[PDB]
Each structure stands twice: as C-alpha cells, then as structure tokens.
Design a protein around this ligand. Structure first.
Ligand SMILES: *[C@@H]1O[C@H](CO)[C@@H](O[C@@H]2O[C@H](CO)[C@@H](O[C@@H]3O[C@H](CO)[C@@H](O)[C@H](O)[C@@H]3O)[C@H](O)[C@H]2NC(C)=O)[C@H](O)[C@H]1NC(C)=O
Ligand SMILES: *[C@@H]1O[C@H](CO)[C@@H](O[C@@H]2O[C@H](CO)[C@@H](O[C@@H]3O[C@H](CO)[C@@H](O)[C@H](O)[C@@H]3O)[C@H](O)[C@H]2NC(C)=O)[C@H](O)[C@H]1NC(C)=O
Ligand SMILES: *[C@@H]1O[C@H](CO)[C@@H](O)[C@H](O)[C@H]1NC(C)=O
Ligand SMILES: *[C@@H]1O[C@H](CO)[C@@H](O)[C@H](O)[C@H]1NC(C)=O
Lengths: 11, 651
C-alpha cells in the first residue's frame, strides 16, 4: 500500500 | 474526561465501505474541495483504475477509460497543480516501438484520451507551476522534450540532458553533457536556461557537478580547476549573475543538501568528510551568500538518504532534528527561532525517564522521524504538523537522554513543541482534520483491528468507535490534503484468501454546529515569561492567535482563516546576525572582527566580491521584521585588504 504526496535537492 | 456521549448513531450511518481487488494500491488526490481520489491497482500483467468524487466513500471503475491498458506505477499518477484537474498516466507499451503512449485527462478524470509519443520517457512528466498545460519530460535517450498543449505535441529542445526542472514564469533550467554520458562527465557539465520554451538559450554555468532551487535562490555546485573539490555558488536572478557562497568546499564523497528554503533564507546541510554519517547545518542571510554555523553533528546518512530534519509548520520559527553525540548516541534538538539557538525538548509531565537516562527524575523528549524508520524501529509515522492547526505537533518518541530502541508512545504538543504530553500509549497512525477540530488515530498492531480513536479537545481525551464488524489488517490513512475536511479513509485488507477495502467516515454529525465568536480564545505564540515586556518576540515580532477552545466542540470550517495579529518588537543586537569576518566571543555580546580568518573564510575573502566582503559587522536576521530600537552605528571596513595584506602581490 502506497499513497504518494518536498524532496531535498542534493548537490 | 470522556464527556461526549450519544456518538454511535452519529458515526454509523456516515461510515461508508467500498471493496476492491485480491492481494499494488496507489492513491492520488485530484484538486482541493473536489473529493476526487484515484486508485490504481497493479497486478504483477494487469491494471485496474477506480474513481470516487465523494471523498472516497464510493468508487466507480474506469479501467475501460484507459482501454484497459497496463499502466507503469514507476512514473505514477502525474497530477497537475492547483485545481487544473489534470491527470497523466504512463502506459506500458510492447517492446520495439518508436515511442511510448500516455493516457491523459484535463477534466478531473472523467474522460481520458489516448496519445502516442515521439519518445520513450525516463522520468515522470513535470507540470510547470505558472501554466498547467505546459509539461516537460526527459527521454531514455537523455533528451529534453516540451509540450505547450497538455502533452499533445512534443518538441525536443536539447539532445543531451542530465537533469531538468521548472522555475517561476515558465523558465526551464537544465544540465547537459558532451563526450561521455552523465556519470562520466559528472563535474565537467554545463548548466543552461531557456526563457522561452527552447526557442532561445543561455549557458548560465560551466564545470558543474549539479544544481538546485530553493525558494528565491538558484544554487549550483562547481568543480575547481586542478582539483577534485567543489563549491556552491548562488544566483538570485536566474543565473545572469553569480556569487560563491561562504561555505566550505567538499570532495566527491561528500555532499550538500538544501534542508529547507523560502523567500527569506535557506538551511544548508554540508557533510563532514570521512564517511561519518553526519554534517553541519548552516543558515543563510537574505542574499543567500553569507552563512552561519547553526548546528554541529547533524545526522544525515551516506550517499544522500535520510535525516530527521523537520519544519514544524504549526508554529513560526520551529524546526526539529536529530544530532549525534561523541558517545555515538542520538539526541533530538529543537530551535524556536530559525536555527539561531538549538536545545533539548522539554520532558513530558506524564512520563518517567527510560533506561537511556542517567537521572531518573530529569531527562528530555526525543523524536522518531525518518532515521528511526530507516533503521527498522517500530515507527509507523514521522512527526505531523498542519499550519492551519496552530500549535499542534504529533509524533512518536522516547523520554530519556537519547532515542531508545523500545516501542515508543505517541506524544503531542499544543504550543509548537515548548511543552509536551503523552497522547496515546503505544504506536499509532494519526491525521488532523478540520484545522485541529478533530484529531483521529488508528493503532499499529501485528494482528487486525476494527476501531478508530478520535479527540475533539486536541489529544487530551480520546473516544473509541468500532467502524467494522469483520476486521481488517490496516495499511494506511488517507485524508484530503490541507487538513480542512472531516472525511478520513481507513485502508486495509481482510484476514487470510484476501482483498482490499476502505471504510470512510464523515464526522459531520459529531461536530453538529459550526463555531462562533465565543468558541475562540486569545493565545500568544512563543510565551517564555509574561512578566517580560518583550515576551513572544521571535524574529523581532509577536503573534497573538484566535484559537479554538479545547472544551468547545464545533466545526472550524473549510473556509477557516487562521486569525492572528502581529506586534512588532524593538530591535536589539540579537535581531542582527554577524556579517562575514566578525563573531561573538562572549555569550550575549557585540559582533567583533575575528583576527585570524582561516579555512573557507580565507577562501571567500580572497576569491569573492568586494560588496559582500565590505561591511560594518552586522546584518539583519532574514525574515526578522523588527522596527526601531538599536541600529549598528559602527563604521564600514573593507576586509579584502586585511586578507591580501599578507600576500606579496605582483606589481
Ligand atoms: C516552514 O513551514 C512554514 C509553513 O509551511 C513556511 O511558511 C510559509 O511559507 C510560504 C512560502 O514562503 C508562505 O506562502 C504564502 O503563500 C501565499 C499564497 O500564494 C502568498 O500570498 C504569501 O505571500 C506567501 O507566499 C506562507 O505565508 C508561510 N506560512 C505560514 C503558515 O507561515 C516556512 O517558509 C517553512 N520554512 C522553510 C525554511 O521552508
Ligand atoms: C465530506 O464528504 C462530503 C461528500 O461525501 C462532502 O460533501 C459536499 O458538501 C458540499 C456542500 O457543503 C457540496 O457542495 C456543492 O457546492 C456547489 C457550489 O456551491 C453546489 O452547486 C452543489 O449543489 C453542492 O452544494 C458537495 O457537492 C458535497 N459532496 C457530495 C458528494 O455530495 C463534504 O464537503 C466533506 N466534508 C468536509 C468537511 O469537507
Ligand atoms: C440510517 O439509515 C438507515 C438506512 O437508510 C435508516 O433506516 C435509518 O433510519 C437511518 N437513521 C438512523 C438514526 O439509524
Ligand atoms: C480504444 O482505442 C481505440 C484506438 O484504436 C479508439 O478508437 C477507441 O475509441 C478506444 N476504446 C473505446 C471503447 O472508446
């Protein structure tokens, strides 16, 4: 069971 | 406690079952104030698509509307922004095609239309923020396509593209390669922009490792010439002009991470060298250029991954995260003022200290967020906070001198994490509804369940209600994003053969009346000490809220404005951070020059810009909106000369 929705950009 | 009665008949006729399929569910909401939910079951070669428009009480099958094709969950249900009503599902196609095929709707999933594409997509399609008809996508051949007509007609705008993403006013940014592929040319890339959908172009950066956007700022990591290291550079103007940040350079094993961002400032994690599993938080100024060590030994895993860093959205200035001791134990730190000062969370009054604590009487609360979960502790949900539900913070935790491995209880705050209390014994799943009118909770158990707990008085008193005769193995909750509805959906499956199911409960008849000018009370935010004149002055101002009474029982409503009023405090020295080259030696004192500028301080003062390098040693905290009071009288001083003084310069 998944219910997808702010990811943190990695540099 | 437990004053609400005559409640069984109120929930019974509002409970609404609906069954699906034999034992990959995938749920996406479509637009605010619609009730449109889309389930995509996937058998793995078969798919089945469902659709409510009454907040998940009743569904209807629309597998037919996608010509009963197999859909790839990998990309998942690409939902458009706002109430644009747009849904795009990416179909599996038989191998050896020219390109892929997509099922797309622009009418809240009433009429899907088939569309073959000129390319095979590698990513989910990205909806522009400005205009919902404008999509982009990156092919398997690393080619950036764009469509102006909601994915009808696609135009390939560049040939070799590693990463692309939208910005404000339909501007596309992206990174490109030359000789090899992406992984080989990592470091030797260049960063483009197009203002006008790939008609015009501009090489806004070179020798790039990677790029990213947070709030107002464009960030880009850049490799140094004759070195394996890289440095972050910041543009506030879509990459026309650039300035190197006042942050340390890092190697190829280490990373940067935009923990959080807005118009005012950015929290920046910088990994510590040597595979340590931690780094250092730095908070920016309004320029995004000068940084300031907020927190040491901030826990953040190898190769990106997980952190406990958490914006407590239910109060201004509040952020929770987790840090590692020298000991090699994990403690949870809270900041109430945008990462100026950090500290331990207050121990709950209704709790004894666990086995981690040296002292039995005295300890602190610790919070289970993404790290606890990753390490397979018995933690169903990370912390929860809704901005409309002012004050309210719900999370799992341990009470002691560190995070403990024991099965945690659920603790709640009503004031943005100054004070706490045990909400429920043992782990639960939780959802806030109607802006803090009703909190709702389901137990996490090995064996199946049939009951749901609810609290009208913000966690202080709970009421049990049996929502089903034949019990279910619970999997998750689903509510309408925004946390303004009163329509929870309880998902699970039957005892093992087995199949999916969803009991959806309206709470309309429980909160029978709407609220009134009598139900709300005055509440000051950030109340340290009322006897002080400057009580509640975070970032140079106070806020006083109208807040729903705990005792009172009513619907706030879908159109509930959070009523607050500011009070602008006087500026002290504390409202100013120290600009580059200065520091605070004594605790609570003036910003004064550091004599030895070393490390990346010395790097900035040499390699930099004179504008940021000349200063009176003070800048206003970003987002700090004080008036009057102290203003830095000190004379300006150019710091480049002092640094270059020591070097013999060529004629
Ligand atoms: C931590 O969380 C809070 C709450 O989520 C963030 O504050 C919110 O910031 C947003 C974006 O800057 C503000 O949005 C507003 O949107 C309306 C409508 O478009 C617009 O009229 C306003 O000018 C503004 O852009 C919002 O005011 C604000 N919300 C609250 C409740 O304070 C905060 O930015 C987060 N911190 C970080 C570093 O991301
Ligand atoms: C929980 O779910 C129920 C549905 O299961 C939601 O009911 C909705 O209630 C509103 C009335 O307040 C209906 O709004 C419509 O508004 C338009 C424009 O004003 C009007 O022309 C229509 O005649 C209608 O009144 C809406 O259709 C209705 N939904 C259904 C399926 O009947 C309810 O909003 C949810 N509860 C909360 C608190 O969000
Ligand atoms: C609930 O719904 C049923 C079926 O429509 C009806 O018989 C009953 O009168 C309703 N009200 C109550 C209070 O049970
Ligand atoms: C299925 O796709 C075909 C394309 O050949 C289309 O003509 C048809 O309208 C679709 N099915 C239904 C039942 O409409």
């Amino acid at each position: 069971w998944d219910a997808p929705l702010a990811l943190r950009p990695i540099l | 406690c437990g004053r609400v009665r005559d409640f069984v008949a109120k929930l019974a006729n509002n409970t609404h079952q609906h069954v699906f399929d034999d034992l990959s569910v995938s749920l996406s909401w479509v637009g605010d104030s619609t009730g449109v939910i889309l389930v995509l079951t996937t058998f793995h070669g078969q798919s089945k698509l469902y659709r409510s428009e009454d907040y998940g009480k009743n569904f209807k099958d629309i597998t037919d509307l996608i010509n009963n094709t197999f859909i790839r969950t990998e990309f998942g249900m690409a939902i458009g922004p706002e109430n644009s009503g747009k849904v795009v599902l990416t179909a599996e196609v038989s191998g050896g095609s020219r390109g892929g095929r997509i099922f797309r709707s622009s009418d809240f999933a009433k009429n899907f239309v088939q569309t073959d594409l000129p390319f095979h997509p590698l990513t989910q399609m990205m909806y522009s923020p400005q205009n919902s008809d404008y999509l982009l996508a990156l092919s398997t051949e690393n080619g950036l396509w764009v469509s102006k007509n909601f994915g009808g007609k696609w135009e390939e705008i560049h040939k070799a593209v590693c990463l692309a993403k939208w910005g404000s006013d339909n501007t596309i940014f992206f990174t490109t390669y030359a000789n090899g592929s992406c992984k080989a040319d990592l470091g030797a890339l260049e960063l483009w922009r197009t203002s006008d959908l790939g008609k015009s172009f501009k090489t806004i950066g070179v020798k790039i490792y990677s790029f990213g956007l947070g709030g107002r700022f464009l960030f880009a990591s850049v490799m140094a010439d004759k070195d394996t290291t890289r440095r972050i550079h910041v543009s506030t103007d879509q990459g026309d002009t650039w300035s190197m940040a006042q942050l340390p350079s890092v190697g190829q094993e280490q990373f940067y991470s935009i923990l959080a961002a807005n118009d005012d400032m950015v929290f920046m994690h910088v990994d510590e060298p040597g595979d340590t599993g931690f780094g250092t938080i730095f908070t920016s100024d309004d320029r995004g250029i000068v940084y300031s060590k907020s927190l040491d030994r901030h826990l953040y895993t190898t190769t990106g991954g997980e952190t406990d860093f958490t914006n407590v959205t239910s109060l201004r200035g509040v952020y929770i995260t987790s840090v590692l001791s020298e000991d090699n134990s994990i403690q949870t730190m809270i900041t109430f003022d945008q990462g100026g000062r950090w500290t331990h969370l207050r121990k709950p009054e209704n709790s004894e200290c666990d086995a981690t604590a040296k002292n039995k009487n005295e300890c602190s609360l610790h919070i289970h967020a993404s790290y606890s979960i990753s390490q397979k502790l018995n933690v169903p949900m990370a912390p929860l906070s809704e901005p409309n539900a002012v004050g309210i913070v719900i999370a799992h935790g341990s009470v002691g001198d560190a995070i403990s491995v024991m099965v945690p209880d659920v603790y709640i705050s009503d004031d943005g994490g100054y004070s706490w209390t045990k909400m429920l014994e043992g782990p639960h799943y939780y959802t806030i509804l109607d802006s803090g009118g009703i909190i709702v909770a389901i137990e996490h158990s090995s064996r199946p369940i049939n009951v749901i707990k609810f609290s009208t008085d913000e966690g202080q008193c709970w009421q049990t209600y049996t929502f089903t005769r034949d019990p279910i193995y619970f999997t998750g909750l689903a509510s309408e994003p925004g946390a303004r509805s009163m329509n929870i959906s309880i998902w699970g499956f039957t005892e093992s053969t087995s199949q999916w199911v969803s009991y959806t409960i309206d709470f309309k008849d429980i909160l029978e009346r709407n609220c009134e000018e009598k139900d709300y009370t005055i509440w000051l935010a950030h109340s340290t000490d009322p006897e002080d004149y400057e009580d509640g002055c975070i970032l140079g101002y106070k806020e006083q809220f109208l807040r729903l009474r705990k005792s009172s029982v009513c619907q706030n409503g879908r159109d509930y404005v959070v009523t607050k009023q500011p009070s602008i405090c006087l500026c002290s020295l504390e409202d100013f951070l120290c600009d580059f080259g200065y520091y605070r030696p004594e605790n609570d004192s003036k910003c004064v020059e550091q004599p030895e500028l070393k490390g990346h301080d010395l790097e900035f003062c040499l390699y930099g810009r004179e504008e940021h390098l000349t200063t009176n040693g003070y800048r206003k905290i970003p987002g700090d909106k004080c008036q009057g009071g102290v203003n830095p009288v000190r004379e300006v001083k150019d710091l480049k000369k002092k640094c270059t003084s020591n070097f013999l310069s060529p004629e």
